[PDB]
């Protein structure tokens, strides 16, 4: 059942992850609701809608509000450098 992958995106060629996130959390969780064309995530191809977002760049997402998750993602994406996401596959 459990299928967890860690992927690193070098954000050299992209300005945004190109994801929407829904829900919050050992009940519930933060999920990829949608993936947008021209984003780093779509280009990489490994992360899909329905994947649960666990960790971004050693910041844990498992017990975090959706509001705070959006803030953190905006903060991370706006600064230069590779982004490492750990997700649980659907």
Ligand X SMILES: CS(=O)(=O)Nc1ccc(F)cc1C(=O)O
Residues that bind ligand X (CB under 6 A): 16-21, 39, 70, 73-74, 77-78
Tell me how far, at minimum, the Cβ of 1 lies from ligand X, in Å. Answer: 26
The CB-nearest residue to ligand X is: 74
Nearer to ligand X, 2 or 37 (CB): 37
Tell me how far, at minimum, the Cβ of 34 lies from ligand X, in Å. Answer: 10
Phi, psi of 4 (to 5 degrees): -110, 125
Tell me how far, at minimum, the Cβ of 77 lies from ligand X, in Å. Answer: 4
């Amino acid at each position: 059942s459990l299928n967890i992958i860690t992927v690193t995106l070098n954000m050299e060629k992209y300005n945004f992850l190109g994801i929407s996130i829904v829900g919050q959390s050992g009940d519930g969780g933060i999920y990829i609701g949608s993936i947008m064309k021209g984003g780093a995530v779509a280009a990489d191809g490994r992360i899909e809608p329905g994947d649960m977002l666990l960790q971004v760049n050693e910041i844990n997402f498992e017990n975090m509000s959706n509001d705070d998750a959006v803030r953190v993602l905006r903060e991370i994406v706006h600064k230069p450098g590779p982004i490492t996401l750990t997700v649980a596959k659907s």
